[PDB]
Structure 1
Amino acid sequence: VNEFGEVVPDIPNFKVKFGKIRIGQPEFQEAQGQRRPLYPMDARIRNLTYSAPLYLEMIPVVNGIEQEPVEVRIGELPIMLKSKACRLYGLSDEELIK
């Protein structure tokens, strides 16, 4: 992201500078939107994509002056099992059975 920075639109006045990224816990919203955490045995049994949402804030630059950053989610991202970012990391023996 720090390669791109500000690029365009065509109007000379407004530009957008890119901020930082955070990665949320693996969750999934269906139709009639409702967000609950996924659990990989459930995500290999009804054809899902075990994934996490990708939040990215942007900087509205009005003639130089930065005044209010808004965080917009861009998309989703697949996530590796038993990695540091998924829900099974450091999780004890009697719970992996659960």
Structure 2
Amino acid sequence: SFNQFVDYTLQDIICEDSTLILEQLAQISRKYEISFGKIYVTKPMVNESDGVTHALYPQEARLRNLTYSSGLFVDVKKRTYELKYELGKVFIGRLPIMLRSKNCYLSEATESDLYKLKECP
């Protein structure tokens, strides 16, 4: 029920209202729309206070009182119309991930490495 979620529902929620439009009247009128893209989701990490960012392992999350999340990324179509005519990738948040999901580092990792990952197999 999480692998289902991260894969599909996340996107279908975006695709519902990618678009929303603002039309400025002139004295020929303007019309501004903005629309989203397909959603991109990272492999989990932390923004440390200094500024540095880096991958994070579930173990270190527990003892740094961190949060096992991965970021989100979507495409933005900023555009304009003037009104009948039209003249990158965007961060949108951090998503915690159910452990042992495809997006978690561990959903593949080897049993031996689980020891090197200090996670009880």
Output the TM-score relative to the length of structure 1: 0.86
1:58/1:42 CA distance change after superposition, 3 Å:
same
Q: Within 1, Cα distance between the matches of 2:15 and 2:96?
A: 22
Shift of 1:57: 1.1
Identity %: 36
Runs of 4+ deviating beyond 4 Å: none
Specify the code of the residue in structure 1 equivalent to 2:16: E
| 1:18-57 C-alpha deviation (Å, 9 max, x unpaired) | 1111111101111121111100011011211110010111
Specify the code of the residue in structure 2 equivalent to 1:77: L
2:113 corresponding residue in structure 1: 95
**More strand, by proportion:** 1
Which 5+ residue runs of structure 1 have no aligned equivalent? none
Match runs of 1:24-39 below 5 Å = 24-39=42-57
Q: Within 2, Cα distance between the matches of 1:8 and 1:62?
A: 9
Q: Within 1, Cα distance between the matches of 2:22 and 2:51?
A: 32
Output the TM-score relative to the length of structure 2: 0.71
- The number of equivalent residue pairs is 95
- Structure number with bigger Rg: 2
- Secondary structure of the residue aligned to 2:59 is coil
2:119 corresponding residue in structure 1: none
**More helix, by proportion:** 2
Give the counterpart of 1:50 among 60, 68, 86: 68
Q: Within 1, Cα distance between the matches of 2:22 and 2:52?
A: 34
Shift of 1:5: 2.4
1:6 corresponding residue in structure 2: 19
Which 5+ residue runs of structure 2 have no aligned equivalent? 1-13, 25-29, 117-121
| 1:42-74 C-alpha deviation (Å, 9 max, x unpaired) | 1011211110010111112222549xxx11101
Q: Is the 8 A contact 2:37 2:74 kept in 1?
A: yes
